[PDB]
Amino acid sequence: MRDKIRLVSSAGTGYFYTTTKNKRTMPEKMEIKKFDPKIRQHVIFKEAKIK
Amino acid sequence: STKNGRDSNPKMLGVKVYGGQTVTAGNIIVRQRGTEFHAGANVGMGRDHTLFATADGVVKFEVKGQFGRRYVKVET
RNA sequence: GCUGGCGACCAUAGCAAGAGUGAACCACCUGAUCCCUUCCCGAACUCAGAAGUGAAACCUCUUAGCGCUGAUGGUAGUGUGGGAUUACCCAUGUGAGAGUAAGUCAUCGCCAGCU
RNA sequence: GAUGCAGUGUACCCGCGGCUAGACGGAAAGACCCCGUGAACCUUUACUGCAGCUUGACACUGAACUUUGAGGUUCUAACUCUGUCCCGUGAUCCGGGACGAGGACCGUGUCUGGUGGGUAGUUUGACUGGGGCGGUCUCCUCCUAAAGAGUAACGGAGGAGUACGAAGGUGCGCUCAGCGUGGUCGGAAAUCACGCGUAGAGUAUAAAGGCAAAAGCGCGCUUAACUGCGAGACCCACAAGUCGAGCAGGUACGAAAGUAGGUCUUAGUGAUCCGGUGGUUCUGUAUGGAAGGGCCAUCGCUCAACGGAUAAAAGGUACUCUGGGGAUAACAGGCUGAUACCGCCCAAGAGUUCAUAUCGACGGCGGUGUUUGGCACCUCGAUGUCGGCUCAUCUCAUCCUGGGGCUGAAGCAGGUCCCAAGGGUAUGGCUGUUCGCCAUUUAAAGAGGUACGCGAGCUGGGUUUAGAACGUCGUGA
RNA sequence: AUAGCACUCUGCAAACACGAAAGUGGACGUAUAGGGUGUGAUGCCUGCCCGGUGCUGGAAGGUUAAUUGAUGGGGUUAGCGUAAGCGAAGCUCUUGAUCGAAGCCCCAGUAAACGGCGGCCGUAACUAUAACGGUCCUAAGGUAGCGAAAUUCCUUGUCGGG
RNA sequence: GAACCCACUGUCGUUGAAAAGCCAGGGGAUGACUUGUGGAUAGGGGUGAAAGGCUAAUCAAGCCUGGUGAUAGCUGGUUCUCCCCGAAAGCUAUUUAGGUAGCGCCUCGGACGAAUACCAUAGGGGGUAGAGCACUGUUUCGGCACCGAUGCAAACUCCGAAUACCUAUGAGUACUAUCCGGGAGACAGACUGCGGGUGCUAACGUCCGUAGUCAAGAG
RNA sequence: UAUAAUGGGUCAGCGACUUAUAUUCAGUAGCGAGGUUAACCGUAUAGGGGAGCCGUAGAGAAAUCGAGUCUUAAUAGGGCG
RNA sequence: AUGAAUACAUAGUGUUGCAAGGCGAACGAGGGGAAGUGAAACAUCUCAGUACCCUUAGGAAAAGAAAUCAAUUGAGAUUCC
């Protein structure tokens, strides 16, 4: 089905979100702008392995 | 062996506060699957079509508009 | 008294048919220069204007044609007590739906123009 | 299924010899059947151990020569001999000594892989109109559901164990489906144009409740599919589940008032324990660290028997056993009468004509309580029988004999219906049979009830314990 | 159970059995002997299948244990740095290269080892049948003999005798 | 074919003469024969020409004593008196279904009093009974899918009650309502009327809703 | 359940909710913001023995604070007091 | 004292003297060591180092004078409450 992925903050705070994704339709790594409560700002979050 | 034998759990829908009663803001008035009743003055609509009060007052039901929709409002 | 905008109300207020309106208002109307616009098109949206017409449209009036509203009386159902078991009867309270007579071509509010 | 209740009939008090129809007679807390998170023994490709057997490493375990870590040849001194001789010693044990044959092998200890019903401990779900076989077990929608909520059946019908970075947010914008007319291929139905009437389209997906400010359909920009929360409610045994205005921070789209805490909503799911990953101004066994633990976020379940007993589990018993149940099956009784048997109503037609002498289609209405069944009320601290024998008693829906009506009744016969229960109503062959077929009789060889009458009156051939065999099923018991 | 038959194991300190061991039976026996297994005088005989499981014999390819411990990653501190921090050696936690047997995978044989021994349609001058063919699947598709049988549901099969 | 060793048939016996016999018949009777005395094998063991046979009238694991007062959601039983109150046989979950746990129902103590109930009046939502054909299906007869007549529906609705339910106000009547604690029992129900599913509009049948009675209640 | 469901032939005697420890609630008594000792000593129910226990303060996982405390960027809001 | 293989010896043999063995309550020390049961099943676990078997003391036995604890640098051998 859809695999689980983590979106990790690029600010280096270690904060992350979790979601799902379809590998066949989205082969590339996902990037999206999200809020980081650790620094209280909106920054880019990038895909990583959920492990 | 019958192919039937299933049913879902009850959902407990219906009118919770009737006309003429007094409510406090946040009180649920109607639980409904679809918009059998529509939200009038001082009444808000939730993501599952639940109708709740947004002010203190007295509940009133009515039929209004060009489509004959049923409305429920709160009078302060 | 006519016209426009915004509401109340949501058919007794609606559809259909027929007929009227240009002083102002509204509508068509001119073309596309700059604003703006079309998965093409000045058709819509937009701009800049008055050479024509109330033709269309919108409004106003008439008509019970379609529709809508609708009694009185009776019937069905039904709470309580009693009597019976194809689901009725009595006392008492309540009382439709359909149909019949009949009604209807709405009624109000705020602001602004033209007589 | 009554000596003891009701109504009624009969009946003076008490022995003795007989008899076994009843006292659901006595005897043994039913052995058949079901249940208990009972027992035992047996089986196996159920689970998990162990013995036994086997593999390699290390130790007991040494020496000298060769060849490409390993192999080959030789030796004796560890070690072996259930081989010979000598002594203890009057001794086929044992010990010591001398030989001989072997020899760093074999064998043993620790560790280790394999095999392992040989042996051992256990497991092998529940619901269920008895149990088994079949089906089902969690979630969503409709009906049953009696106009608030809720409401059962192995009641009637369908779906789910997902999808989507856009199919989410916002600003702006747009209406479907069908039919008719014309128009190249082109038509039943592709696309174009104009009308007519009309929500009948659509909404990722089943159904329901909804959907014009469209919740349906497009385009541009975007990430609110945010973080901290949260007044107040719904639902509710708990554990859980649901709706939510508003406040703060950071955003997106709008000129703006504003809208946005995923998708029209209701299914798309799994507690706790144990572990993995990121972070952490928590803890840190003398102290400083660290390991480990806590807190925040997150990952690993068809635990689907879906509140999930273990990380880990199938069968047989006719060789059997215990605790219970008439809470629950097989016999007989009871309720019922679908089925069964018997009767009646209408009457197309058959009968050379002629419905009704005799039959009688399509349909309808009853009776009985001999069949097959349904239910599970009595009995599981026992109501203990398929047939035959012996002995019966009652009903009449009459087999014979008796009395009648009609006839498609000339007579003799026959057909059909009515009355009638007094008496009577075969012996054999085959088979355990009841039944059935057959032979030969008789006026006739009737149909039924009586715990399918009768086993404390007889038998014991059949069925249904323990032995053995065949066919068939199973790896096997 | 039996005499008879067959298979298989056992070279002697035998195989096998009892036992924890010592030891004992086998046997004061020695393959014309001893143990296990099946069949059951005698007569005629005993067909096909090694795919499965087992047993026996090969092969040295793949997989694998203990043991061994090459590498990599951390903890700690002398020292070095204003600091952030860096940081040898020594101890220590962890990772795990290489070597490493049997077994298993693989290849043959073996049924008087455990076991197995099939289907669907046509076809000869009357009719019928099918000597004879068409094929599908297996490891192979029942030879001799027998047959309503201690085996046959239908079934009290059909015919003959009594 | 006697003794001796067996046990094929039948009657009797079955609280026997006898916890396996008597009687009349029956088989072997120089052999794999019968028998005395004394020894050996001991319980998951022995022995077995094999029946799970036998191992002291006991055998799918002997007997005795200990663990031991094994455990038993099962059955039985549970002993003097009076007074007051008084259930349930339901929901949810459960290797759970004849057990148990939370809730519902009973009792006792404390707190607190009109916050409670019956009835009247007023406000409110509904989609059942009935009815209807406007949708979804289905039905008959005409005319040309439509038009005119005509029926039906748990999973149809253009409509639509009585009752029931929620709220506010009020008279009268009544020890009502609520909160906090100690103790429970119960979770096998039955029949009858009314509304239904299932069954044949069968059952003293079965499963729900609702009321009464029994249960636990005599006359 | 008269039940034809169980048990009892009869009498006399025996025969089944106990004991220890801990804990909670209720009555009652002492003392009271306090109450109380245990082992042990003691010619001993006395008198000594204060170690310990309960109450007097909560919040938080904890470090920590404390009539407050936790969560948070927040003195907002909210939870326990 | 005597005395092999075997030379010296040793093994072996004999005499004398001394000692031991067996029984019996509980308690002690040591060598082995279950299952019923509970977990509402059961295998880890429990029961429990219990029951039982075996060896062996004393009036008691065992233990005992820190290569022990503690964490203000303090305590000071065993045993029992």
Curated annotation (Swiss-Prot), chain B:
Molecular function in Gene Ontology: structural constituent of ribosome
Query: What Gene Ontology cellular-component terms does the record carry?
Result: cytosolic large ribosomal subunit
Q: Name one GO biological process term.
A: translation
Q: Where is this region: Disordered?
A: 1-12
The record, for InterPro entries, names:
Ribosomal_bL27, Ribosomal_bL27_CS
The answer on whether this UniProt entry bears the keyword Ribosomal protein reads: yes
Asked if the Swiss-Prot or TrEMBL record annotates the protein with the keyword Ribosomal protein, the reply is yes
Alphabetized UniProt keyword annotations: Ribonucleoprotein, Ribosomal protein
Homology family: Belongs to the bacterial ribosomal protein bL27 family.
- What name appears for this protein in its UniProt entry? Large ribosomal subunit protein bL27
